[PDB]
């Protein structure tokens with residue numbers, strides 16, 4: 075569409091979208107893979123074992 | 129080598145930290161330090177594990193500042209150069225039970241008991257062997273086997289004759305959270321704990337691998353496409369040949 | 377009250393049709409060895425028959441049936 | 452056959468060129484490979500750079 | 514700079530192949546064709562055609578050597594048993 | 607002209623990685639050259655960042671490796687990238703000298719490329735042995751003993767080279783301290799022998815899997831083989847990232863986590879896998895002087911290969927008989943790795959002697975006879991008379 079003119083035409087704004095798209099991919103994909111890895115291992119982590127010490 | 133001189137093959141148990149997405153059981157390490165202290169702290173050093181690594185893994189911050197203040201380490205000497213002792217802190221290593229190697233050999237009939245920091249990575253089988261060693265002692269050895277005086281039999285040790293006597297008996301420890309302390313329950317808990325002591329990164333080595341295999345296999349399917357994109361002008365080239373005028 | 381979990385399974389698997397057929401081989405060795413090691417002139421022999429091979433057969437059948445059956449019972 | 456009769460390219464050609472779209476279904480998949488290689492070359496630099504920082508047993512003696 | 518010897522590769526323009534003539538090459542831009550148009554019918558039907566030709570040279574040199582290894586690794590465990598100690602004491606002696 | 611050809615430094619980048627005319631028909635086996643260039647940088651960048659924490663004394667060798675893996679931030683990443691990225695050095699390199707044997711890339715005019723190949727292959731066996739000896743485990747101490755005791759079989763100059771290598775009377779603190787400062791060095795000899803290896807390649811260009819001339823249809827390197835080499839970079843970084851994060855101690859030996867103790871021999875005293883087929887050759891000669899020579903002539907028999915290949919067509923691609931006997935050799939190099947990791951028992955002491963003869967009759971009997979029967983069968987199959 076007109077997606078090409080705003081984003082992919084100037085290389086100064088193409089690669090400025092790669093870095094602003096990697097700044098969101100760092101924060102989100104790390105939190106999305108941490109919150110899955112602990113949820114798959116619910117009951118084995120120290121944050122759960124510290125709750126059994128009541 | 130004979131099968132006796134090779135040791136019996138330690139079988140494949142269903143550990144809770146096998147598989148690629150699973151971590152350690154941090155209620156089986158906290159119950160696995162208690163079996164280390166009450167049973168094999170008598171004759172096994174743990175000289176690579178600092179006291180600070182137990183904080184947050186299986187004990188709190190006050191439970192380690194009251195476990196390191198039971199032992200005593202060498203302070204810097206006083207203003208007259210006399211040596212002196214101090215109670216331990218969070219930056220010290222877990223002290224072994226013997227002062228030197230010859231004191232260790234003298235107490236166990238010549239046999240130096242190995243340091244258990246890396247004993248699961250340094251044995252063929254990993255924790256499947258360290259578990260099955262401790263529960264593998266027969267009541268009486270098979271017929272014809274002449275044991276030397278002062279050597280115990282179990283088949284999982286390479287050679288047949290081991291120097292450690294059968295040590296795990298039922299209900300010899302009393303767990304804090306009310307767990308039935310059998311021989312197999314205790315031997316599973318140290319073998320998880322000795323697996324932690326040799327691999328303190330095993331929780332985080334397996335979740336950095338989940339970040340990397342997801343990125344570096346979606347960077348490989350993408351790079352297949354950009355190869356097939358840029359090579360589309362070469363893979364569909366067409367050559368036609370009509371032979372030129374032979375008068376030249 | 378609660379006994380050991382692992383010896384609950386080994387006595388469970390030493391009474392099946394294969395466990396009884398393998399302890400009968402260990403009892404055919406360890407009876408042969410005992411009537412051999414009571415013979416005169418036994419200590420000055422070039423080799424003595426032992427039952428490590430029959431014991432390794434029995435101990436391999438047991439621990440391959442209690443390898444995936446054990447760790448659910450352990451809390 | 453002459454050299455003015457180009458051969459059959461019809462099995463590989465698109466059904467609609469539309470050069471604002473074909474240069475956007477192909478700069479997406481180049482930009483997506485650039486995005487993970489900038490989130491993947493941050494971690495490669497930050498692994499080696501943070502390796503030189505204050506280690507664990509130095510931080511215990513602070 | 515200094516010269517060098519004769520090679521069998523030049524550069525762009527004087528590559529050093531034979532003189533070619535009357536061979537014309539057409540190619541379409543990769544922005545105008547669909548990449549990966551034939552991933553299917555090539556991963557199934559062409560990858561079997563490549564596997565039909567060059568598998569009988571990677572199976573018989575791995576069938577000769579793996580039958581040789583498994584017939585010795587099974588022989589090693591015979592003479593180190595209780596049944597084959599009388600064959601062991603004549604082979605090492 | 608363009609600035610990429612007019613600059614003094616960029617004209618070397620242009621003529622090597624940008625405008626280098628590669629043949630159009632080269633398959634994915636030609637990507638092993640770029641993988642070894644990547645896999646050399648991983649063994650250097652994760653070597654400098656790991657030698658800032660390594661103390662080289664014999665009392666602090668093994669205790670500082672555990673200091674890396676427990677105390678340094680991402681030390682488990684740095685060491686496992688170095689121990690498994692060195693096993694992946696010798697697996698790409700073994701698939702780079704097998705592409706060379708198969709596609710006939712040793713023949714003329716590329717004999718001066720094959721010879722610098724065998725020199726780089728020697729300095730990498732040397733580097734992976736010195737670096738293994740810097741960890742000072744029970745396989746690393748006792749591996750240095752059995753290897754450097756082999757030089758006490760050189761006649762009349764035997765015991766004075768061994769006692770010069772050791773710096774004493776056994777493998778001690780003078781040895782591990784010099785096996786680190788030597789092991790730091792040699793990857794800056796390999797990285798200056800690879801530049802002497804791309805220079806011998808660039809005068810005649812790469813070969814191609816048909817064995818015919820590639821001067822007709824050339825395509826440049828940039829934007830064609832950059833992005834073809836980027837497929838196997840991201841595949842090599844994927845099979846590495848399973849052997850670093852998910853199963854890191856599979857290729858190594860368990861005994862190497864026992865600290866180095868010179869008073870107890872281990873059960874099976876065996877170097878790391880890639881040096882195994884050069885260990886079943888050494889151990890198969892029932893003599894000490896010839897066993898050193900036959901092990902050293904197992905690398906230098908790679909030089910007689912341009913002069914024993916009697917085939918008039920280049921490469922095994924269009925040959926039937928000399929394609930079967932290639933894979934007889936390749937699955938003989940694998941068996942020879944397995945005899946090197948088994949005990950010296952019957953029948954492995956006879957398997958290792960037949961499978962050493964097949965390693966030394968491929969280059970000297972099987973190749974110059976099969977590649978003569980094939981030259982006659984190509985002739986009499988077409989020329990009717």
Ligand SMILES: CCCCCCCCCCC(=O)OC[C@H](COP(=O)(O)OC[C@H](O)COP(=O)(O)OC[C@@H](COC(=O)CC)OC(=O)CCC)OC(=O)CCCCCCCC
Pocket residue numbers: 352355356633634635637694697698837838841842845
């Ligand atoms: C363990 C340590 C390893 C560390 C090194 C990591 C890299 C290992 C690379 C091994 C290798 O280079 O073998 C290449 C082999 C021969 O290539 P060829 O040119 O003859 O085939 C043309 C292909 O259709 C191009 O097809 P195309 O280029 O259009 O697609 C890209 C292709 C990339 O695949 C690969 O790179 C190899 C896996 O995408 C895929 O199809 C993957 C789909 C999941 O590729 C093949 O297609 C397999 C043919 C049989 C070879 C068996 C290999 C066993 C060792």
Ligand SMILES: CCCCCCCCCCCCCCCCCC(=O)OC[C@H](COP(=O)(O)OCCN)OC(=O)CCCCCCCCCCCCC
Pocket residue numbers: 567568570571635700701703704705708815922923924936939940
């Ligand atoms: C010191 C000296 C070092 C010597 C190195 C020793 C060997 C190291 C092992 C490296 C393995 C490399 C295998 C050979 C790779 C180069 C050969 C090759 O590229 O195979 C191509 C071959 C047929 O391809 P074509 O080129 O003939 O296609 C044209 C068709 N007209 O395709 C095929 O026929 C199938 C290829 C299948 C490869 C099988 C690899 C086996 C790997 C060993 C497995 C070990 C565990 C069992």
Ligand code: HEM
Pocket residue numbers: 163164167168170171172236239240241242244247258261262285286289290291292293295296318
């Ligand atoms: C939970 C309890 C224990 C555990 C997990 C444990 C662990 C181990 C391990 C893994 C080995 C190595 C076996 C091998 O090298 O193959 C070993 C050997 C040894 N252990 Fe134990 N141990 C325990 C209790 C004890 C105790 C209480 C003693 C007291 C004397 C002891 C004395 C020894 C000795 C002397 C050896 C050396 C045996 C030899 O080298 O032959 N162990 N122990």
Ligand code: HEM
Pocket residue numbers: 646649650652653654656657660671685688689692693695730733734737738739740741789790793796858
């Ligand atoms: C082609 C290059 C190299 C290869 C094949 C190589 C290979 C190896 C191998 C196999 C080990 C043993 C790892 C283990 O088993 O624990 C090792 C250790 C080591 N290497 Fe390298 N290495 C290379 C280059 C380098 C370089 C350039 C350095 C720079 C300082 C370096 C530093 C070390 C250190 C400090 C060790 C000991 C610590 C450890 O083992 O992790 N290496 N190397």
Ligand code: HEM
Pocket residue numbers: 635636637638639640642643646699702703706709711712719720722723724726727796800803807811812813814
């Ligand atoms: C650090 C190790 C090495 C590096 C960086 C390296 C680098 C390269 C590169 C980049 C190429 C061009 C790509 C290709 O043709 O596949 C190449 C080609 C070649 N290499 Fe290596 N190489 C190494 C080791 C070796 C070894 C050990 C040998 C042989 C014993 C060898 C023999 C060859 C041959 C014969 C070619 C030409 C193949 C052809 O063009 O047909 N190289 N090398």
Ligand SMILES: COc1c(O)c(C)c(C/C=C(\C)CC/C=C(\C)CC/C=C(\C)CC/C=C(\C)CC/C=C(/C)CCC=C(C)C)c(O)c1OC
Pocket residue numbers: 622623626639640641642643644646647650651654655797800804807831835
């Ligand atoms: C024929 O066409 C070619 C071709 O021409 C080339 C070049 C390659 C690629 C091959 C290579 C690149 C192999 C050459 C390898 C080298 C020259 C190795 C170079 C590596 C080094 C010299 C080591 C790197 C060292 C540094 C970068 C120093 C900085 C490092 C550190 C740790 C400094 C840290 C300090 C601080 C303060 C952070 C091909 O693959 C290829 O075929 C397509």
Ligand SMILES: CCCCCCCCCCCCCCC(=O)OCCCOP(=O)(O)OC[C@@H](O)COP(=O)(O)OCCCOC(C)=O
Pocket residue numbers: 514618619622623640801802804805832835
């Ligand atoms: C796909 C992978 C991408 C990764 C990218 C990373 C790698 C980038 C490539 C960098 C260049 C690699 C090759 C370097 C090389 O081989 O050149 C060294 C000089 C060779 O010069 P020549 O071109 O053979 O002679 C051709 C001449 O015209 C130039 O020769 P002259 O310049 O004089 O030689 C200098 C040698 C000096 O030696 C001494 C003794 O002083």
Ligand SMILES: CCCCCCCCCCCCCCC(=O)O[C@H](COC(=O)CCCCCCCCCCCC)COP(=O)(O)O
Pocket residue numbers: 481484485488640641643644647829832835836839
């Ligand atoms: C010394 C180390 C040797 C390792 C060998 C590495 C061989 C592959 C290197 C590929 C470099 C890619 C440059 C492509 C390029 O500049 O094209 C540029 C633009 O291409 C791109 O933007 C590609 C997207 C960015 C890809 C980033 C990949 C980083 C991963 C690097 C992993 C290896 C270090 C010119 O492309 P064009 O001529 O088609 O217009």
Ligand SMILES: CCCCCCCCCCCCCCCCCC(=O)O[C@H](COC(=O)CCCCCC)COP(=O)(O)OCCN
Pocket residue numbers: 612613614615616618619801
């Ligand atoms: C491992 C190295 C072994 C030897 C191999 C050599 C290969 C070197 C490849 C290096 C590639 C990167 C070099 C880019 C430099 C291009 C800029 C340039 O040449 O401009 C140069 C100036 O260079 C400099 O000032 C600093 C160069 C330092 C380079 C340090 C890396 C000027 O260029 P010019 O030719 O137009 O000069 C006009 C005269 N008034």
Ligand SMILES: CCCCCCCCCCCCCCCCCC(=O)O[C@H](COC(=O)CCCCCC)COP(=O)(O)OCCN
Pocket residue numbers: 717718721722798801802
């Ligand atoms: C960063 C670059 C570092 C510097 C590299 C460039 C400078 C290196 C200077 C090297 C001078 C010493 C090399 C002399 C060897 C010349 C012999 C020769 O080229 O014969 C080669 C064969 O070379 C070899 O087999 C091994 C050479 C390995 C060299 C290892 C040092 C045959 O040469 P040719 O193909 O012209 O044969 C004509 C037939 N009559």
Ligand SMILES: CCCCCCCCCCCCCC(=O)O[C@H](COC(=O)CCCCCCCCCCC)COP(=O)(O)O
Pocket residue numbers: 336339340343344488490491492493494495496497498647648651683843846847
């Ligand atoms: C400079 C030599 C390094 C080569 C590394 C190749 C080996 C592959 C395994 C790498 C794992 C180490 C990184 C890591 O643990 O990150 C992990 C994430 O995984 C990745 O991102 C891997 C992406 C690799 C992209 C490759 C691009 C290389 C560009 C180099 C430019 C200098 C952990 O990241 P985190 O610490 O959580 O931010």
